Symmetry: D2
């Protein structure tokens, strides 16, 4: 683990919205044990920064305790300067035998110049660098950024921070799959006919409309978050407990996926989106996407995978729903076939859990049976980054594969379908699954 936290961009928006609060909460849980150096261009004093931190934490609605804050302030120092100027880094070198985590909450155009400067001042040897999203908007841009970082950093020093990944129950979903033989036996194409992934948020674009309008749902949730979720569900078991062992298995999944077919991709935009501040009146940007893909390997060949994600849907829920085949044969006999086949349902967020849907006879009635059980993201990622736990941080090979996968939809986007806020999305998403299993009502907490 690191023993020093250095934050570039400590006076920016993300620091104000999330980072200061997250540091405060880690301090409250007594999980901060090391100094923190804030870096920015603002010509202010440490006391002014502390005032800014205090206000930012109180503004979030977090319960404020002065003793906790005073411990945090005691760890904090501030260094002002220009991130393109070697003098800043000479000064930084005086403040730093350390094992620093450099956390860059700065514009992406500055990631490379900062890292290149840290290198010139010999400040990377025992370091890691965490970069805030975005880290690319397509395959070529991600490759260019990545080439500049890798010129001075090993892959294992690079932590690509995506807040959605902080919601993933990575260890728990592995244990569910790999420690339970009743489930592991079912977890392939011989039992599973079809998979549906649903990511629904019951709110619109609340802020940063100008930023969202240049990103869109595909880049925002599909490329990294949802594909990573699919990989966790679909991957072969890792041969070890480390992060690279896990990332080896995820990359294998993506390598067996063909690139998306734009004709099997449906793009939606909620009515009212064009009136959000920062969004262009003629925007073609999607707030919803539904698509069909597949994993063409021994475990999953021929199993269609349908994915839908979108803003302003009826609920907040992320689900992976796996449909089993019916028991084969015996169409000529009664009482061998329920109206719907068995299903394994994984709620990823919120309140993660698993539901096994079966059918049962009671008297001369047959009915569905639900076998249910159970099994912050920002602070989790920050703590993990500091401790060098890379499980929640996508590795370069996966990034490049997932960009390859989504690129055709970015290059030839299909026409926008409008949908009402609070609906399940455009009707054209129903047509996607026409000869298959209908989109089901998601399992809610």
């Amino acid at each position: 683990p690191s023993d020093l936290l250095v934050i570039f961009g400590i006076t920016g928006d993300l620091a104000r919205k999330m980072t200061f609060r997250a540091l405060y909460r880690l301090e409250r849980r007594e999980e901060l044990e090391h100094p923190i150096i804030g870096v920015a261009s603002d010509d202010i004093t440490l006391d002014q920064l502390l005032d800014r931190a205090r206000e930012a934490i109180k503004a979030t609605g977090e319960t404020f305790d002065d003793a906790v804050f005073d411990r945090l302030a005691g760890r904090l120092s501030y260094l002002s300067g220009d991130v393109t100027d070697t003098g800043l880094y000479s000064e930084l070198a005086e403040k730093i035998d350390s094992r620093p985590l450099y956390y860059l909450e700065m514009p992406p155009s500055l990631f490379a110049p900062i890292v290149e400067n840290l290198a010139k001042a010999d400040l990377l040897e025992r370091a890691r660098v965490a970069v805030e999203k975005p880290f690319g908007h397509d395959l070529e841009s991600a490759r260019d950024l990545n080439a500049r970082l890798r010129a001075v950093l090993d892959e294992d020093q690079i932590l690509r921070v995506d807040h959605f990944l902080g919601k993933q129950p990575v260890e728990e979903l592995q244990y569910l799959r790999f420690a339970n033989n009743a489930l592991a036996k079912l977890w392939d194409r011989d039992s599973i006919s079809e998979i549906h992934i649903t990511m629904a948020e019951d709110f619109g674009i609340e802020d940063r409309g100008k930023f969202y309008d240049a990103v869109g749902a595909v880049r925002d949730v599909v490329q990294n978050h949802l594909l990573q979720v699919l990989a966790l569900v679909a991957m072969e078991p890792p041969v070890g407990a480390g992060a690279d062992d896990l990332n080896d298995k995820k990359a294998e999944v993506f390598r067996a996926m063909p690139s998306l077919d734009p004709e099997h991709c449906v793009r939606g935009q909620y009515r009212g989106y064009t009136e959000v501040p920062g969004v262009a009146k003629d925007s073609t940007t999607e707030t919803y996407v539904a698509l069909r893909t597949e994993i063409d390997n021994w475990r999953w060949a021929g199993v269609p995978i349908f994915l839908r994600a979108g803003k302003a849907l009826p609920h907040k829920v992320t689900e992976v729903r796996m449909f089993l085949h019916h028991v084969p044969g015996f169409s000529f006999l009664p009482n061998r076939r329920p109206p719907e086949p068995n299903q394994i349902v994984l709620r990823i967020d919120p309140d993660p859990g698993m539901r096994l849907q079966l059918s049962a006879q009671v008297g001369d009635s047959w009915h569905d049976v639900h076998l249910d059980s159970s099994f912050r993201p920002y602070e989790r990622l920050l703590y993990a980054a500091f401790n060098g736990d890379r499980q929640l941080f996508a590795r370069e090979d996966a990034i490049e594969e997932t960009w390859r996968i989504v690129q055709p939809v970015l290059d030839k986007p299909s026409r926008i379908h409008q949908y009402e806020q609070g609906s399940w999305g455009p009707e054209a998403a129903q047509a996607l699954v026409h000869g298959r299993h209908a989109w089901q009502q998601p399992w809610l907490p």
Copy 2:
């Protein structure tokens, strides 16, 4: 193909009628399910009014809620005929009261030495053509006695007219367990030796021999629950799917199970007797009759070869529960990694009685804790068994009545233990039984705490 339209009960003044039958008839009447006359037959020289009085007291004695209007409907259906079952005159009289237009169900609540004489007499008086005959347990106490009894009945009845009534079977969720296994692919995929490592069958009763000590002492736990009830349960759990929907299609599959089973090894059978058993009225002071049995068996076919099947059944155990517990193999491999192997493997648990259901036991991670997860559901109905059997018999539904070929295979299976019984081990009432039953499963899965109703 047709239900019966007349119920004729031999032994209507006997103990089973008093303990169970009258109450069961009353409850069917309350549910408005009796639609036909009932003729009671016994040797007692009494009037119909006296019989009604007996019926009334018998029902009230059980603790059943008594409603006079319901009882009056039942009385309205009942007539009484007195005579001796070894006298030809009784059957001539019966022949005047029952026409060739009837479809009688003859229910014989009588000693088994009388089943053949009664049936042979019904035949001589031409009273069997549209009939079925339901015989109260016991119907044999070993392979030879069952074969002899059976040969005498089959001389005048087809197999499908013979209904062997065993109250324990009335508790079995036959349809529901089939649906569970054959209509749910998530379970069908697990239901073989590639996923299942071991099976434990537990039948516990939390009471001793409350009555009929002299009868039990001649029977014992093996004959009482294992030969018919528990082996029939096992067959339901283990059989291949029937290729038809009828009772005979079902019974063809059960029989195939038993034909792949070797006879029991008396050395792998542990026999117990609870302390205090010898003081039960009617029990001999030096009895070596077992009130508990634990055994090891197997089904040596493609589905189950190499899966050990352990069974235990007994009186005066800690709870009332009948379960089939199926242990899965662990997910194979990765012994060198933490958190791939829970302390116990997944299990499929079928509570047969009471309050039938299924529990799937899995393991889950929450934080840095790992714990058991219980995925529970109820199926079928809480069992009532006597009335269910009586109704089924009357309607000709033969699912809950063991067929002759199965009866003979199960007697073959248990016979060696009856011929050369192993020594009795004493155990305390309220314990799980003799410690020697623990040794049976040494090197395998420990006997688990059963899944009890909430």
Copy 3:
């Protein structure tokens, strides 16, 4: 308990002349006849005249003739003349048959006479400890088979009834079970998770040489499909028996048929070879099929969704009966080269002649890929028609019922084929020596092409 006396009704008829006399002669040569044989027919001839008939019949077949062997056979043979509908014949028979006898009655007579003979054997109290073997045909559809059967079962138990079908004598019943049930490399593959499709081919490279009138009333479906080929399918598809006896085996076969739906006539192609109508006894406008191709299925846990195609016919290019099982391709990896051969693996069972198994796989040698044929033999060659026939006669005499279809299977197979009998599709002509009508190719159009059968070397 085997029989200890053989009684043959129809000893002067065509089957006796073509087959039965030769088969008895061969059993005598192998020293397998140990009991007297009573021939029965209407012809008013002496025993000597019968012996002359037997002698000529044997020599006519091309069998090597040894006069000492023939004399042993003649020594066992007696003859009884009369009308099989008259009680007097049976009184006479009752003198020749002792109260301690265990007769096999073998009826090589017209089928309209089976019931009258058996009913007469009953009236004369000659059926205790007997069995009765009846020559094909034993019904021409479900209703006619049920009627015949009801008349026999009124006086016989099922296990006294042996329905003789010479084709079944070719079936390697024990050896195919061993192949399937004793080899885990095969048993692991023998279900819908590995097998995508099954093709059954029965080809004969000859037309109708004799008895044209008889064939014209029967047709390929009744001749080979109803009993022979469906029985072969059942052997290939059944669950393993729980015991070694005939009834355990027949329980498993029946289960197969009970999970099969009746045939779809729209998926059935009927053929007739050019020249068939010029065969003596065949009507000039006959619509009787000498060829059939059809689709069926077995709708159970082992085989659901696996299409089963069957073709059988006269005047095809070769003599061969084959069961060809296609495996699925290894799934996945379409995006990679060299994971998928041009055809999937196959398991091929040659049933007749010269039974064997071929496993077809693919192999890489340099930058070449090619088919690999892993061939082996099992059982024994029963191609020459005499061998099956003698095997059945011997089995019947010894009470071995494995090669004789049981009543429940008979009725299920008639149910299965009935719709094709009731609504026969239009006849397609095909050339002798061809593989049959081109419409049989269309049957498998979205599936695996009919492959060249695996022939003996």
Copy 4:
């Protein structure tokens, strides 16, 4: 991208004289050499003298000699004399080799010199577009392999390092993959649900013919098990690669080794053939093993619980390398006859020589049951030592890394074997021409007996 220049350090040494010159000559005869070759050594000789030496070496091997072929080879060859620890050599080499060259540096040199040479190539800026092939050995244990490797990786990427092990040149890497991954009949069987046990046998029917002093410091475990045989096992056992490249293949092999526990020294039997101590260079009291038999396992989803027995040794009865996979018996039905052959089905892979596959099954013929051998060939014969060598050289030149173990696998295999190196079990003597020490029989007591290997016809 293939290389376009071959630079051979050690061109006047023994390996060059025994193998390399001949291999270059053969590649030239097949018209597969297209680029210049620079020979480097300390000897103060001319190019002509080198050529004369090369000519004689080639003729000595028994290779058919054609002067026109040799002349083409000579036309490609230049010679540079100097000392590999002197910076002047590398300045000279830097003149001869342009900044646009793609050199393959082949080091047929003592291993203590690999790092100094590579470090000198780096100081002279000669590695940018290069690969470096190093002759075995490249370590004698985990620590020595890690140290060597650390020095190379300081200046080379892993993909510029080619670790040359002549045994690997015999491996039918593509063909064995095709066999497994394109045939569903085999892929269905290729896991612990069908396979009970695996035996790997590597037998050579000769002793230590040369370089006794070298072998006596190495031993069978280091010589054939650590790299060759474990790599063979990994090929047999691995999950399918997600691509056709070398790194995709090596990802799968590494995964196998990561699921293998380190060897148990108590389950390892070490042998030494009688006469070994009289081989020149071998110490009179040597405890170096010329034979090993061991037990291991792969503790993953595919193979957990399947014991893997391996045996390798010198002076055994035949030259053959085999992987023999025993299937489980068909389960159940112990109470019935004819459901269980005396031995279970087996899948047998002959790796070398004359690679092929045998599927052992059982068949019924009459009242006899017997073994059936379903044999076929795959790949090509690489038995003669020159072929594997030339194959490796060509592959190295073209940048095909499939036959070259990757660093992660090297380190896992050293971890696996290390306990046996640390605590070697007592030497058992065995006679030349025998199958080895009797203590190797005791290893498989309670499991499947060591079988007679499947030999080429």
